[model samples]
Target: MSRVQLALRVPDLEASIGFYSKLFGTGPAKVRPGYANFAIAEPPLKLVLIEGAGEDATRLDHLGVEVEDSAQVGHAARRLKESGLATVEENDEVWVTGPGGEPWEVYVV
Candidate 1:
């Protein structure tokens, strides 16, 4: 299954988390020191928030594909490389950029 993923840079982590929790009618599935993410099943969306990045940076941070396993991530990386799209691999994850310079990550959990 494929789901739309959006990563946002937020000025205030707590406020953003609270807003999203209310808006989505659920709290985040994961939270860290400066980051939080929500995996909403009803909407099939993966929303991520990073603190302190939106103060002077763009609100939109990056996009991503979260796969079920590492093999899928490797397959995607290989396919992108074969298609002539340059990729950066780190810790078994792949990162690519869109034509418009939008960042994309392929990761496995």
Candidate 2:
């Protein structure tokens, strides 16, 4: 299943993780030193929090779509290309831009 993804750059990792955990009613599906992700099944959301400053820390880190497999990433890249949106695929991920130049990542688990 495809899931909507949201990656955010937060100033505090542990604090953010705690907040999201309570909000989502679950802990992170995966966690690293400076990152955490919640793979929510019911709501079909892939929420990620990364510790660091984004290009604009006040805004989101980036948007993404999480797919079930790498093949879907390639398919998304092809579709983006067909639509004349320049895309780059690597490491099981496809990067592209929206009409407003917003960055997007199509990735597989």
Clashes of each: 0, 0
Q: For candidate 2, lDDT tens digit of each residue in 46-89?
A: 99999984443435789999999988998998999998888888
In Å, residue 46's CA in model 2 sits off its true spot by: 0.9
Worst 10 residues of 1 by lDDT: 52-61
How much is the lDDT of residue 57 in candidate 1? 51
Model 1, 27-80: lDDT tens digits are 999999899999988888899999875296538789998888888888999999
lDDT of each: 0.88, 0.87
> Could you list the CA RMSD of all candidates, in the order they appear?
1.8, 2.1
Candidate 2 residue pairs in clash (backbone atoms < 3 Å): none
- Cα displacement (angstroms), candidate 1, residue 7, comes to 1.1
Off by more than 4 A, model 1: 53-58
